[PDB]
Design a protein around this motif. Sequence first.
Motif, short mmCIF file in Angstrom:
data_model
loop_
_atom_site.label_atom_id
_atom_site.label_comp_id
_atom_site.label_asym_id
_atom_site.label_seq_id
_atom_site.Cartn_x
_atom_site.Cartn_y
_atom_site.Cartn_z
N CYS A 72 5.79 56.72 -8.82
CA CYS A 72 4.55 56.18 -8.90
C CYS A 72 4.73 54.40 -9.02
O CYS A 72 5.88 54.03 -9.35
CB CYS A 72 3.56 56.51 -9.93
SG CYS A 72 4.27 56.13 -11.67
N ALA A 114 8.61 60.08 -13.10
CA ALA A 114 7.51 59.89 -12.22
C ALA A 114 7.98 59.04 -11.05
O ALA A 114 8.97 58.24 -10.98
CB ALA A 114 6.68 58.88 -13.33
N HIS A 128 2.18 60.87 -14.82
CA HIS A 128 3.18 61.44 -13.67
C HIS A 128 4.43 61.83 -14.04
O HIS A 128 5.29 62.48 -13.37
CB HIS A 128 3.31 60.34 -12.44
CG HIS A 128 2.10 59.93 -11.87
ND1 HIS A 128 1.45 58.66 -12.00
CD2 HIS A 128 1.01 60.57 -10.86
CE1 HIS A 128 0.26 58.56 -11.32
NE2 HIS A 128 0.11 59.80 -10.62
N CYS A 144 2.30 52.56 -11.55
CA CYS A 144 1.59 52.76 -12.74
C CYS A 144 2.18 51.59 -13.65
O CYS A 144 3.20 51.33 -13.78
CB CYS A 144 1.94 54.13 -13.70
SG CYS A 144 0.76 55.29 -13.43
N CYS A 187 3.96 58.23 -18.03
CA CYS A 187 2.73 57.98 -17.62
C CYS A 187 2.16 59.12 -17.33
O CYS A 187 3.04 60.22 -17.50
CB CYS A 187 3.02 57.00 -16.31
SG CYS A 187 3.67 57.71 -15.07
ZN LIG Z 1 2.58 57.16 -12.95
#
Ligand SMILES: [Zn+2]
Length: 139
Positions: free
Chosen positions: A50, A48, A112, A52, A110
């Motif tokens: 990101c 991922a 992603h 998050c 997550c």
């Molecule tokens: Zn994420």
Amino acid sequence: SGAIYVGNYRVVNRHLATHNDWANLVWEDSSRDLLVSSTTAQGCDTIARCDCQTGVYYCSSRRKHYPVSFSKPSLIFVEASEYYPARYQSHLMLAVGHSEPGDCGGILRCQHGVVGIVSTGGNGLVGFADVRDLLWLDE
Ligand SMILES: [Zn+2]
Ligand SMILES: COc1ncc(Br)cc1CC(=O)N1CCC[C@H](C(N)=O)C1
């Protein structure tokens, strides 16, 4: 136990790395409890990219996945163990949840992709070593 397999890389907790992991060492950081070794076979895990703060982690001590809210990666004091003296571990994210020492290596994900792996725990809190900043895992 447990690892992330991405491209020609294997990501494991540094305290659990094998002789083969060290003989094929790409990068390791004691302060992050991470070690990356190279592999001949190709990995398919998606990392991922990101920020998050929610995800799901695998807890082998319960054979279950748990949803958690987790903190942003940061420097957190970690008690001494057979692998490290008492120190601040960097890039560590905490969540309220169950873990036991053998849970290290469980993946946190997550929507992603892969966020990190279980690295610490105690007092009803579980810590995950973040891997989202390691942009080179993809190239
Ligand atoms: Zn994420
Ligand atoms: C998931 O780990 C745990 N969970 C619960 C308890 Br009690 C205990 C643990 C073990 C734990 O936190 N450790 C031991 C191995 C190295 C670790 C590190 N990154 O410094 C720290």
